[PDB]
Symmetry: D3
Subunit: 247 residues, 6 copies
Amino acid sequence: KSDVFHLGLTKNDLQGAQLAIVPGDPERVEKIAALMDKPVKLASHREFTSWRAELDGKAVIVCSTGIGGPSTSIAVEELAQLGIRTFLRIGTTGAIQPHINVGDVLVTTASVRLDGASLHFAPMEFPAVADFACTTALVEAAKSIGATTHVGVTASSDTFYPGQERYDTYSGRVVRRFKGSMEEWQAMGVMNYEMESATLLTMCASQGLRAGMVAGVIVNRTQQEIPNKQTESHAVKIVVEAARRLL
Amino acid sequence: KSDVFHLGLTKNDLQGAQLAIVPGDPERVEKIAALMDKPVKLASHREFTSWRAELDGKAVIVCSTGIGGPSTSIAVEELAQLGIRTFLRIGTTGAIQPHINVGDVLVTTASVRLDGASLHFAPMEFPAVADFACTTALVEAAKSIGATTHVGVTASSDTFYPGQERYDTYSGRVVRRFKGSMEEWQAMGVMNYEMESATLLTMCASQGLRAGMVAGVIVNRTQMKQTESHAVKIVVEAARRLL
Amino acid sequence: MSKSDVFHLGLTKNDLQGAQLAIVPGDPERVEKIAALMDKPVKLASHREFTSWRAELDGKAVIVCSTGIGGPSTSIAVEELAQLGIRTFLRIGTTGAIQPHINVGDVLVTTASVRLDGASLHFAPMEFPAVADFACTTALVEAAKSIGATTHVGVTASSDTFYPGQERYDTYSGRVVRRFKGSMEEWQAMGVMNYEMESATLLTMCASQGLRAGMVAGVIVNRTQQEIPNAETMKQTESHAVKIVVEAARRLL
Amino acid sequence: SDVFHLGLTKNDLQGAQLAIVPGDPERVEKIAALMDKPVKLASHREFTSWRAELDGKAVIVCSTGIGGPSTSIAVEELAQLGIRTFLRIGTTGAIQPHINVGDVLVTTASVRLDGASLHFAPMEFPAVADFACTTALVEAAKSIGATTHVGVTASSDTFYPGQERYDTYSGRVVRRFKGSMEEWQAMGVMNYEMESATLLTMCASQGLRAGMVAGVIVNRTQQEIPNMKQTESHAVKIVVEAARRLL
Amino acid sequence: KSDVFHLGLTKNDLQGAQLAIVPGDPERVEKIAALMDKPVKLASHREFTSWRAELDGKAVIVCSTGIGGPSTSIAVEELAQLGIRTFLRIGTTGAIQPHINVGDVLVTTASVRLDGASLHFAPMEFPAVADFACTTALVEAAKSIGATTHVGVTASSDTFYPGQERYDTYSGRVVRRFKGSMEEWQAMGVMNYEMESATLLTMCASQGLRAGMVAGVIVNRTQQEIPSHAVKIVVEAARRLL
Amino acid sequence: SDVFHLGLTKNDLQGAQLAIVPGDPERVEKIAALMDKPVKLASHREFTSWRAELDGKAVIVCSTGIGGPSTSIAVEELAQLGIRTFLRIGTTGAIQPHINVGDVLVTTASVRLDGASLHFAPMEFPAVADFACTTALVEAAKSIGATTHVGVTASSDTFYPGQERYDTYSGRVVRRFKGSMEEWQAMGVMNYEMESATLLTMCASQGLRAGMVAGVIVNRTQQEIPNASHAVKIVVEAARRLL
Ligand SMILES: Cc1c[nH]c(=O)[nH]c1=O
Ligand SMILES: Cc1c[nH]c(=O)[nH]c1=O
Ligand SMILES: Cc1c[nH]c(=O)[nH]c1=O
Ligand SMILES: Cc1c[nH]c(=O)[nH]c1=O
């Protein structure tokens, strides 16, 4: 009933699909697929909910990764085994630049590797870089609908809290490595924080797979640590139109 | 009304609970809670399904972490904010040692940190060590039900595939770091691979929180229903001793 | 300080004439060659490995300035050019391909680099990506299409050495340190296209300081192929790649 | 002599499989004299070794000297001769305000601020004590009623800069260790010593059992250098009683 | 035409020479060669300008390295391929000790490896140490020439700016690693900053080649960021090593 | 006592500013007896100290014990007492085929395969000897005409795995040191010992002068352990020239 260990999918389920949009939240999978033709549920196991749809007569996959590089690495590997060669990540993010605002769209060229899983594919010297065609499709999709878009570097962390230098926590402390880190990333022109791109981008770029990253800003970190739908469907429109250009 | 960002929980929802059993799978949460008194669902958001139960008159939490350290680190942190001081991880695992059989139970004293999230709490030099009281309770709970128990070191990987030196993959490649690594860990007496303990154990030991881990052996790299059941019985009985 | 705003280059802001883009080759001797593809080229200065020319491209001032070999001298050039007012840097180089199906004469556009250098660490920790600017990479790819080249786009290994860091054994010692033993096979398996010696420094220092940087190179040798092209290894292939960097510069002014 | 440094043969051990390993060669006789039939074996460099009897079974007392390097020599050569269990008894400086001078500390695992541990396992490997050894130490501490704390110990290759002592010739502490004591204090680290990271790592990665017990001779929240027999006695009584349980 | 990929030299060009003086600046190669007998220009390609000369009847090479370890590693390797076994570097430097003056001559015993190229020959644990005979010749040559000389450790950086903790820059900031680094090296007794010695000394010491390092102080960094005995010393030292 | 470990006051030194520092406490008396007016000062742990006189000037002989940690204590506390120059005399295993047992090896700088050196300076800092001390050692070796080799030493925190010895309890060497001896050998490294990296780093980064000399007792291209005076004579003569 399955060709892979976790996803609960066969090659036949994909119907020859070579592109997957990979959100974090299993609940957003249906919402992304509903914007394409002939959307249908495939499987749901753990944090891995998968749907198949169609764009311009070509099969497309939407599959959730869950939170973090570890679960992402499972999803991407098992989709690759099934035939997916192009991965488009759609996520939510916290901006660290003063002039990147809530509701803005961010396209990641490459990520700061503040994760562990990327090291299981390539040494730290290797860049967590997005594919050129994917990044191009994402930027061009963003411009076609008139989104406020920033293109550049993202910091990709294995934690929501200390690795993103949040202090409103149980301990209230941040380990030496990350103490004063956000200001440093800010000075280096890093746009934002998320949790999956370093793993996704490194594992694709070091294994002959294409990957792209687009995200909607839901909090600005120069203002607050914790965020307070419209930003969602903005970036979701982008990832689907970008997918159309990559089939 | 939620006090935390991900778990969708308030401090009131815990009803004074100070201990949590933390399985990986959201679907396993109810199964663990059903072994205790007055089980009720609290919340379900993404990979974080939380139930509350009662054990000898005291409230306990059962909450899933999802796969991997990042997701675990969110669950543990937010449960700690809500008042949880003790964390008991329960799971099923493979084995990398020939002498460990399918049906044996593993109690982890400390973990090899093949993860990234642990480094966000303490530098690599810091040991990913389990709490002594927790480990004791798990060992003595295992001995009380007659389980064949192995106590020692676990390798905690950020990946299911290359970090556990699996070649049956898309690339068929394992990066230099992990090339020949399983045989290395085997020679060092490492019992098994899993994917959450390095993060759990490091973040707890470096923040004044108690943590332990028990796991049932369901497969062996070198070489059923009851094994799952035994490991759960052990973790619930261990919880009784730590309340 | 004989009319210089900077320590090494021997240049003033007036020399730039409002220029905000620089083409940065490695060889001082190639600077005149690159400027010759533009309007009204004039020599500005020559100090150490830093030879610089100003030219005009579609009516706009542009700088060509050599970096020398390696991250250290590249870091001096880029920094002092930034002090002078340059915000966009386009590196044109020669390279040895490591993939069997990238042929001699092919053009390579670098999206990002494996940091086998030391100078990039002086600008950002290793975790930071040695990534090229999107607009620069776009301009190079589009220009490659305008010229009509066989072009490959992807990752480059940027080494602090020509010999052991590129796993060459044809050396005095004949040995390669543990770190780089079997490294070329590893990079090949990771889809890395080629070796050069400046991009990791250039890309990291620009991306971490609000400067735009692109990287393009002509393939003059393939490490997997027995046949090594005649002494003019550079010549015709380099002219092809040089035409692309100049055409790319037009779209970034 | 079967071993290069210790000057011992397999016959000298008389089938002994457990060793109590103090730091000071001058402490070896005093520990052996607490057991039955104490006999001197050898004395070379900082390695003074004695044999004794505990409930009819041969036990070894062998000094390690200061630090992991000399500790690693003693442990290895003792392992070559047949020892499978090592119980370290030491002196320590507490860094938590609540641990008093004369208290007893049982180490579950160590912060690896040494170099020798890396010669047996990479840094990712835990410098963790054996569960049975640790249990024996904790329970022996309960039986004599000593004020005991159980937890993590920072194991340093230096007495001075690595334990953030400033009252030195240079008065300098390298960046790595600047502010490090406060960091360890916040992480719940009980104390500093100089041998356990090496001992615990080399044993846990080679199938050997190791425990660690120590007496507190100074509290670092008060002073850098210690000023008294009451401290040593309890700790030494614990290690001998723990050895009984592990034969 | 050339037996090496970059320098544009044949083995015959060297005329049996086994020692090279290796300055950073190609423009200063002629100057150094002019101090010896029978100076003859050999080649000029990229940052590599080379001259041959004679010293007490023996052939010697002067060959520039350009700025930094990578270009230095090229020059040294290819010169080694052509038979050179001893390398004497002469450079300029910024002193970081208050007692070291502009015009003073610094002889390097070993270098702090703030470069990347050294790691391509030996792991970081390996010392960037100078050859004992070369260091001795430089110290004795300094006595012969007459200069205020200091002997000790040098910090060798892959950058002129952030790695030497310079703030007179475009960004005016320094990465975490190098924030407060100069005063740290200062307290550790490090004499000076340059950009080639770590690569040179490591690659030579780990490959059976002999290397020495001498430099003239052009700026004192306890005072400011912005800035011929050394030359006479390197030539005299070469006399002693033939 | 002015210091915590050595059991000495500044008075015990009689104005001595140079120390010869062997590893074996049993060796201290033997070295001091080669000089004038030898007097025992103290013996605590692995730290046996004697005072002697050389050309009418007070000199200290003090043992370090084995390894960087104990060496770092001896050097630091001697520095506090007034010593500014340290000459280490050790025993060593050669790794080059043409170095004979009994040969004298003078260390210019050391490969830092230790941990204690990092407590004084980051890894980038060279474990280099003092020029005057090295010169005195080389020139002293020349004077008595001993077979001498000058160069780089590998200084290891272990005797066994870090020096790639396989005739051990486990018979294994961690990945980092597998094939390491061949690598050091190809790099021209002369020998292995266990103290110089720490000694040389801590002195060079703290304004103290240090020299390093050793006698070869085994050749590692032939055997791991030997079957089981010139270097000693050289260290005493070198000390004469540094007063
Ligand atoms: C041909 C060539 C040029 N430049 C490099 O860095 N490597 C190479 O192989
Ligand atoms: C062994 C030891 C004793 N006392 C301390 O304060 N620190 C140590 O490391
Ligand atoms: C070569 C050089 C000269 N002056 C400096 O201040 N730094 C350097 O690196
Ligand atoms: C001290 C010593 C002697 N002999 C060796 O072979 N190695 C060492 O480290």
